[PDB]
């Protein structure tokens, strides 16, 4: 009976190209975004008109 050793680097190469969220600080800080947004220019006005 033998163990399969470690498996850290075996799975390091298993997620090649997968999205990464390395940063920490008790909050996972992602490194990818594709957020769609709508901009409402109703109640904004130029500062230098008067």
């Amino acid at each position: 009976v033998v163990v399969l050793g470690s498996q850290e680097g075996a799975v390091h190469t298993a997620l090649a190209g997968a999205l990464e969220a390395e940063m920490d600080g008790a909050k996972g800080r992602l490194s990818s975004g594709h957020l769609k947004c709508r901009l409402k220019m109703d109640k904004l006005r130029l500062k230098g008109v008067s």
Partner: antibody
Amino acid sequence: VQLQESGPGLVKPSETLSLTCAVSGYSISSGYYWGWIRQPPGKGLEYIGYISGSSGSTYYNPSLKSRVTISKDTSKNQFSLKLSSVTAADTAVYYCARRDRVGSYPYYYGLDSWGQGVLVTVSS
Amino acid sequence: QSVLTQPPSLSASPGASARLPCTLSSDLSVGSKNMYWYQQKPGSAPRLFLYYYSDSDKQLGPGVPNRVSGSKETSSNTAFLLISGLQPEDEADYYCQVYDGSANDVFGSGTKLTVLG
């Protein structure tokens, strides 16, 4: 990132000296080498060493090689300095400062944010 | 070796241009060294004043104005801390700093700049 220094008022010679530094506004272990710099009575600034934020590696001074030991603990977001076998000439004003090691902007390779600073003498 | 040196005292009348040099050791080439300047008011925790490497690679303190300039004379390797509009509040102790091959902080002696009156 406003660092505050806290430490005992006085230590006798040849006795362990410990300063505690709370960063209070930035999470350690993200990077940003944290160090300790001193100015004994009124002379120039002398540095002692810094510890890596993320990895935790410690880089010290060649003259203060066997006496100091810098510690780190991100649970309460603090890092400390231990000065063993102090001498009478070690009376100084200490400052725990920040520094960047890998960034692409060389301005932050210097000590950007400084601490308040503590004064410690080695008299009887 | 690798120690910086500069005079203990300098002074100039308010209004003139004060040049604070910083002579590096012989084993350094100032033309490729990121110079770091610290300003220390007498008892208030010296702050980062001006980092200079080139006239196009420079960055000042968070609130210091453009009166503070930097330059390098590569003939005798010596950085400069130029203060053009000398006000009475420019009276402080100024330091310079570089790094060795192993990236150990190398500070300078620094000049206690005094604004006259």
